[PDB]
Design a protein around this ligand. Structure first.
Ligand SMILES: [Mg+2]
Ligand SMILES: [Mg+2]
Ligand SMILES: [Mg+2]
Ligand SMILES: [Mg+2]
Ligand SMILES: [Mg+2]
Ligand SMILES: [Mg+2]
Ligand SMILES: [Mg+2]
Ligand SMILES: [Mg+2]
Ligand SMILES: [Mg+2]
Ligand SMILES: [Mg+2]
Lengths: 141, 119, 124, 210
RNA sequence: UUAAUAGGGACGGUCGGGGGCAUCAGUAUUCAAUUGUCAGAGGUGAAAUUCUUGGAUUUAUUGAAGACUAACUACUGCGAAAGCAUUUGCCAAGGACGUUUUCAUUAAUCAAGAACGAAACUAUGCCGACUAGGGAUCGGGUGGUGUUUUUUUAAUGACCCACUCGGCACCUUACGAGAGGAGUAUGGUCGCAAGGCUGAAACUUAAAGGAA
């Protein structure tokens, strides 16, 4: 099922059936909001924000506890990324792979992986352009 | 008992019987199958090896050596690692000569990695 | 490939070893090996033109015996292959249906009675 | 006179077979006053000389005997190694080629169809030959062992063994003729620069419309 | 709107003989230096060829060069394929697993196009959209248990059993429209072919041979 690979793995998260907050959860919805903005101000991404809240504060899901996703909560308070997170990391990996290539000019394998990452960016970059999340003039490098 | 050292190099085509000190640095006597036979076909025969051992054993007793440590070997390297027929014959002849055999070991050159082209 | 003597020796090596330099020349060979050698040669020439049903006929044996011979023979083949497979020994490839030809096959002349393969399954 | 001893480990699967024959191995070595020990816990075979040993070299042949038994050679064949003329040789074959498919295919060429090629080589050289993994184990007279090595090595270098089988038969016939002994038998024998950065990708039709 | 046992990304401990740059080892081969002894040493089926009393081969010590990575090596691991096996460090990358983290259909198959890239010589397996399995094995995870292990220095595994995801294969299974060979004969055509001793014919002819 993997793209650019022969793997067929199925590891993933299984969201619980019920869609309300847990009974044991006894923290105000507002206090979660200020925790979210504090972390995003510090420089954490929404994915990393979710991990910290779930691990140490009992926030099973931001949507479930607060009624809105981490993305929407941050945008409501003036915090939203310049580019989508998944595209941000894919560009960051592409730069690192490129940076390795100048120093090592005989690494034909790294040349191959750069195709897969760059081609992945185009497909993702195409999608956001259609939805108007990313401005149409946006080109990769 | 004075101890010598007997280097037996048993190739498929010839057998060397070389006796030397414990250091191995000074030769006491060296005899080869070719010297004890008249034909180039029979140098590797056990008969040639037996004669070489007898001459060496006589020469050892004169100088004073009464016992020897045997370190037999084959051609080794990239070729066969099994000693030739002379190697066994030389060892048996030395015992019959009366020289006490101290210790027997194989010192075949076994390459960690032979120089052979993969292509 | 077209050298008859070389190919004949290669195909007949198993019989000569079982029923034994080595006397592979037609004049030197004596005993059961010469009787088995002639039959193998004659069958090979016959297979090209002779109809399969009539050229080869398994000798008649009662029911209970033949299943006994096949069951033991397959047991011997399984032991021979398993001991080799668990070890490093490389064995000659055999078609799926046919029984492997172990040393006992040539010595006991089992093939004439059990046959190369169970023809019923090859049909199915 | 200290005792010269040699130990050879054996795999666990040979435990059943070795146990049954060990009385025979003990008898065969006892003819030469060589003591033997089979350790089923450590899975090891030991041969050691005794005070009654009169022949110095037999211990080497005892050592080879346990080596052959560990490598799955049958005892009736393995016990022949005790004879002076017999010898054992191990030929490496994994180092000849780099392609796995070519390696297996050439190895199969040694065994041949139905095992005919191996058996033909065994009969002509009077040698017991076993093909295992990355090696070929051979046992027989020294002249036979020499012949097996040239066939095995040349087979891995793309020379069909059937050529070597044919030459062996001719040489055996020729050796029986005295007149041509002096004469050579060669006549009668058969004969731009890599770029690190990729090109860009061609944009999809939708991207052109975007 | 869901958050697909669709897909993409994130986080955690990991796994690999995946790749690139350095670095370390190893015995062997060739060569060189010393050095004990002396007539042969390699090679073949025999030789020839080659080296050699200016010491060959062989013995011991030492140095250098190139290649290679034995035994461990497996119907095992990694890689898109070709391929990859010494230690250590650096550089990025990758798979699966675990997740009550995140985007929200962003995907599948793809002619065009782009990236990488002497030899053969006995083989062979019905195929598929497809059921239930068995033994063994590799990587990850959960639980049980009691042996190795061990103690407030840091780290913290090995083995057994049960379960589960994903692999390399092996052995069985239920289901399915999956739409010339071998020879024979030839009043034809085109080719190839017979003989009488040589010399020796326009010459009944010499020497010397062949035959007997
Ligand atoms: Mg992934
Ligand atoms: Mg999902
Ligand atoms: Mg990771
Ligand atoms: Mg790595
Ligand atoms: Mg070096
Ligand atoms: Mg190694
Ligand atoms: Mg390397
Ligand atoms: Mg491994
Ligand atoms: Mg793989
Ligand atoms: Mg599985």
């Amino acid at each position: 099922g993997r793209m650019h690979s022969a793997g067929k793995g199925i590891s993933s998260s299984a969201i619980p059936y019920s869609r309300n907050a847990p009974a044991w959860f006894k923290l105000s919805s507002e206090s979660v909001i200020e925790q979210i903005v504090k972390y995003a101000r510090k420089g954490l991404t929404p994915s990393q924000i979710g991990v910290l809240l779930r691990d140490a504060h009992g926030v099973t899901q931001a949507r479930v506890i607060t009624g809105n996703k981490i993305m929407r909560i941050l945008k409501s308070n003036g915090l939203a990324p310049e580019i989508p997170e998944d595209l941000y990391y894919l560009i960051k990996k592409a730069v690192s792979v490129r940076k390795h290539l100048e120093r090592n000019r005989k690494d034909k394998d790294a040349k191959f992986r750069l195709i897969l990452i760059e081609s992945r960016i185009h497909r993702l970059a195409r999608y956001y352009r259609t939805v108007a999340v990313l401005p149409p003039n946006w080109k990769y490098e | 008992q004075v101890f010598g050292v007997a280097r037996i190099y048993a190739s498929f085509n010839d057998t060397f019987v070389h006796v030397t000190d414990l250091s191995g640095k000074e030769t006491i006597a060296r005899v080869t199958g070719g010297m004890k036979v008249k034909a180039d076909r029979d140098e590797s025969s056990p008969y040639a090896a037996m004669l070489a051992a007898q001459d060496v054993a006589a020469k050892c007793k004169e100088v004073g050596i009464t016992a020897v440590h045997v370190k037999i070997r084959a051609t080794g390297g990239t070729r066969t690692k099994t000693p030739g027929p002379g190697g066994q014959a030389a060892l048996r002849a030395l015992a019959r000569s009366g020289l006490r055999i101290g210790r027997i070991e194989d010192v075949t050159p076994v390459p960690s990695d032979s120089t052979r082209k993969k292509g | 490939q077209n050298d008859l003597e070389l190919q004949q020796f290669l195909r007949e090596s198993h019989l000569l070893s079982a029923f034994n330099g080595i006397v592979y020349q037609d004049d030197q060979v004596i005993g059961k090996a010469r009787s088995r050698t002639l039959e193998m040669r004659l069958n090979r020439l016959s297979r090209v033109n002779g109809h399969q049903d009539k050229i080869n006929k398994l000798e008649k044996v009662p029911m209970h015996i033949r299943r006994g011979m096949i069951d033991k023979h397959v047991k011997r083949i399984k032991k021979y292959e398993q001991e080799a497979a668990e070890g490093g020994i490389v064995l000659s490839k055999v078609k799926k249906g046919q029984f492997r030809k172990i040393e006992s096959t040539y010595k006991k002349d089992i093939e004439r009675r059990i046959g190369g393969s169970i023809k019923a399954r090859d049909k199915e | 006179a200290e005792e010269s001893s040699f130990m050879t480990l054996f795999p666990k699967y040979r435990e059943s077979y070795l146990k049954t024959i060990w009385n025979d191995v003990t008898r065969a070595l006892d003819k030469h006053n060589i003591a033997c020990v089979l350790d089923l816990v450590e899975g090891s075979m030991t041969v050691k000389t005794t005070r009654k040993t009169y022949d110095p070299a037999i211990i080497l042949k005892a050592r080879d005997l346990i080596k052959l038994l560990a490598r799955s050679v049958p005892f009736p064949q393995a016990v022949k190694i005790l004879q002076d003329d017999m010898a054992c040789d191990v030929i490496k074959i994994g180092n000849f080629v780099t392609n796995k498919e070519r390696f297996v295919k050439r190895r199969q060429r040694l065994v041949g169809p139905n095992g005919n090629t191996l058996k033909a080589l065994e009969l002509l050289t009077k040698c017991y030959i076993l093909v295992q993994g990355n090696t070929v184990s051979a046992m027989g007279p020294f002249k036979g062992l020499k012949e097996v090595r040239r066939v095995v090595e040349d087979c891995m270098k793309n020379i069909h063994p059937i050529y070597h089988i044919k030459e062996l038969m001719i040489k055996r016939e020729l050796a029986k003729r005295p007149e041509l002994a002096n004469e050579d038998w060669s006549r009668f024998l058969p004969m731009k620069v890599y770029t690190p950065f990729p090109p860009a990708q061609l944009p999809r039709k939708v991207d052109l419309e975007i």
